[PDB]
Design a protein around this nucleic acid. Structure first.
Ligand SMILES: [Mg+2]
Ligand SMILES: [Mg+2]
Ligand SMILES: [Mg+2]
Ligand SMILES: [Mg+2]
Ligand SMILES: [Mg+2]
Ligand SMILES: [Mg+2]
Ligand SMILES: [Mg+2]
Ligand SMILES: [Mg+2]
Ligand SMILES: [Mg+2]
Ligand SMILES: [Mg+2]
Ligand SMILES: [Mg+2]
Ligand SMILES: [Mg+2]
Ligand SMILES: [Mg+2]
Ligand SMILES: [Mg+2]
Ligand SMILES: [Mg+2]
Ligand SMILES: [Mg+2]
Ligand SMILES: [Mg+2]
Ligand SMILES: [Mg+2]
Ligand SMILES: [Mg+2]
Ligand SMILES: [Mg+2]
Lengths: 47, 102, 109, 199, 117
RNA sequence: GGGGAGUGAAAUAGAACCUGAAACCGUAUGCGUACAAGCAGUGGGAGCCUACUUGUUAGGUGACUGCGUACCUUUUGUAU
């Protein structure tokens, strides 16, 4: 049945969204920290 | 006719036929319960107290029902620090009825 | 009991409360006299509503005009017309032109 | 083995039919097939494609309002979506071995659950839906998938108007139809066709 | 697939405002002031579950001291007299006996005196 | 502009017309407030009113009383 089968446990993850809520863990910042070059749009250190 | 029985680490002012809510104990509904931890027994004006405990005195009770009462909320909020946490709780209890004070 | 409404009246809601509370709970015999000599604009509108309410009881029912007592009077707020008014140094401010809904209710009890 | 309705075993290969059922592989195969059938037809509008919004509404300082740079900004009402999506393809790369292994896995559960009905031959004489309905009433099947070595014209013109019956081919079947339909109707000409295609 | 959030936010706003009812002024009818009144109320509710045991303990001690001073002892000496033996009656069921069962409280106090402590 | 009478299944579908919430503004009944000082709540709690199955049960008020200087961001640090 198409209504029954699923993937194996651990094969699929949920793509955690930064910036939603505060219990999610990535709230209000998205894992960027605080002021600095690596906290803003296009904040890419050159390789 | 009033006694002082220790049930759940605390004691209560128990009379002959009073309903009482007590913390949950491993026993089914309707079964009889005996308390051998009575601390003072009084009957009219004749009052006696236990040396560590009153000897020979018993209080017979039976379980009326079980359940959970009065859901309370827990909020651990920290101002200005980006932290808040919520939790619920319902403590179990056991309504008992008192039959006689031995 | 019977009621009468005036949905859409030029006078604003706040100004008409001070006349409504003056007659809420009186007899129609002196309610018409208080508004017949009141100095406010709301008195003319409210007496026109009250006489229509009395006429409704007289015609649609067999209630005499003597036993009627004005029971419930409340003035709500209706649509407000928005228009601008020029002011100093180029700034223009918005002016609301308010209205009200007057509901006079008389009872023969 | 696959007992045909004419009371004759056939002795299929045991690698295709009668194998371990790895459900994760089947889930991946059906997800990839169902995503590949989707046409990507979506076009929102960024802040660059919305008409207008060229100049600053007001000065940087001295106005008292918030710092606005263009009318057509995502924060503004009539502005464009901040992450407007151009049309794109939805196609997952499924390996040729992986696709065939999913067929071999699902065809085993079709035998185990007795969803697979094998017949000596299924063919209609003239195009007529009620004739095919009567033909299927002989087997007592409803909402059946008909798989044949070659889709005849008469058989194809029939069953299009029929509600729950669909006709496919061995090189036209998919992982989705084999699981969706309640019963699968194969022919002895088709079970041999799967031998060289799957194993 | 556009999702409009005008039906699920109302449920949460009404849920907060239901708990925030009975408060003065804007605290029970505007969401942005009601949420603070709920968070602060929950914090006070959490702290007062701890403080309740302290406040009742302080009241029972005060009542037992008042009941004992009428008999001829002090609370500090009364607890010592009880602890020379093991009478093991809690403050909750000593303040109840101090008020209602005055004869039983006197019968406890005389035995505490007899303990000589 | 209303009160009737009629149409319609339904006019609180009456044209400013399906549903029609929130801010906002009123009218009714219950309770508390004019000797009492502050993030307006929380723990306790008298009296009153409504409800019952007639109160070691239910709901609304909360006199009084201990603690208690809102949320977000920036910070070594904020009621600030
Ligand atoms: Mg963290
Ligand atoms: Mg920041
Ligand atoms: Mg820094
Ligand atoms: Mg950094
Ligand atoms: Mg000019
Ligand atoms: Mg204004
Ligand atoms: Mg442009
Ligand atoms: Mg330019
Ligand atoms: Mg647009
Ligand atoms: Mg290929
Ligand atoms: Mg009719
Ligand atoms: Mg309606
Ligand atoms: Mg309607
Ligand atoms: Mg409208
Ligand atoms: Mg409709
Ligand atoms: Mg409407
Ligand atoms: Mg008011
Ligand atoms: Mg003051
Ligand atoms: Mg925020
Ligand atoms: Mg500084």
């Amino acid at each position: 049945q198409l209504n029954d089968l699923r993937s194996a446990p651990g094969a699929r993850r949920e793509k955690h969204r930064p910036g939603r809520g505060i219990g999610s863990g990535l709230g209000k910042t998205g894992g960027r920290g605080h002021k600095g070059l690596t906290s803003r749009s296009g904040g890419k250190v050159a390789p | 006719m009033y006694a002082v029985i220790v049930t759940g680490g605390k004691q209560h002012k128990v009379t002959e036929g009073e309903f009482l809510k007590v913390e949950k104990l491993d026993v089914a509904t309707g079964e009889a319960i005996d308390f051998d931890r009575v601390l003072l027994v009084a009957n009219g004006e004749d009052v006696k107290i236990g040396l560590p405990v009153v000897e020979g005195a018993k209080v017979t009770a039976e379980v009326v029902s079980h359940g959970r009462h009065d859901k309370v909320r827990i909020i651990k909020f920290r101002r200005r620090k980006h932290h808040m946490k919520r939790q619920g709780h319902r403590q179990w209890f056991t309504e008992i009825k008192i039959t006689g004070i031995q | 009991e019977v009621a009468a409404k005036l949905s859409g009246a030029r006078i604003s809601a706040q100004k008409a409360r001070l006349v409504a509370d003056q007659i809420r709970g009186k007899k129609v015999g002196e309610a018409l006299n208080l508004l017949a000599f009141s100095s406010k604009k709301a008195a003319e509108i409210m007496k026109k509503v009250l006489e229509s309410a009395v006429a409704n009881a007289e015609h649609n029912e067999g209630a005499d005009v003597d036993d009627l007592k004005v029971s419930t009077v409340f003035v709500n707020e209706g649509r407000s017309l928005k228009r601008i008014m020029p002011r100093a140094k180029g700034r223009a401010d918005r002016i609301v032109k308010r209205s009200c809904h007057i509901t006079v209710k008389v009872a023969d009890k | 083995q696959l007992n045909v309705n004419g009371a004759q075993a056939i002795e299929v290969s045991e690698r295709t039919f009668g194998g371990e059922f790895n459900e994760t592989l089947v889930h991946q195969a059906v997800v990839a097939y169902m995503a590949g059938g989707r046409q990507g037809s979506k076009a929102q509008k960024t802040r660059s494609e919305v008409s207008g919004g060229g100049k600053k509404p007001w000065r940087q300082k001295g106005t008292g309002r918030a710092r606005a740079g263009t009318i057509r900004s995502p924060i503004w009402r009539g502005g464009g979506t901040t992450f407007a999506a151009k049309p794109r393809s939805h196609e997952q790369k499924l390996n040729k071995k992986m696709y065939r292994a999913a067929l071999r896995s699902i065809l085993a559960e079709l035998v185990r659950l007795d969803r697979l009905v094998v017949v000596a031959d299924f063919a209609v004489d003239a195009p007529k839906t009620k004739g095919l309905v009567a033909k299927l009433d002989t087997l007592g099947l409803k909402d059946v998938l008909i798989v044949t070595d070659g889709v005849d014209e008469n058989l194809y013109l029939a069953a299009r108007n029929l509600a729950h019956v669909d006709v496919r081919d061995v090189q036209g079947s998919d992982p989705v139809s084999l699981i969706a339909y309640d019963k699968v109707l194969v022919t002895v000409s088709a079970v041999k066709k799967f031998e060289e295609l799957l194993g | 697939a556009r999702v409009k959030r005008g039906v699920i936010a109302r449920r949460r706003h009404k849920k907060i405002l239901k708990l925030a009812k009975g408060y003065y002024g804007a605290r029970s009818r505007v969401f942005r002031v009601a949420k603070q009144a709920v968070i602060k109320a929950g914090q006070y509710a959490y702290r007062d579950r701890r403080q309740r045991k302290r406040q009742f303990r302080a009241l029972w001690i005060a009542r037992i001291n008042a009941g004992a001073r009428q008999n001829g002892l002090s609370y500090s000496r009364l607890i010592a007299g009880l602890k020379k033996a093991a009478i093991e009656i809690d403050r909750k069921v000593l303040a109840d006996l101090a008020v209602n069962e005055k004869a039983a409280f006197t019968a406890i106090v005389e035995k505490a005196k007899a303990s000589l402590a």
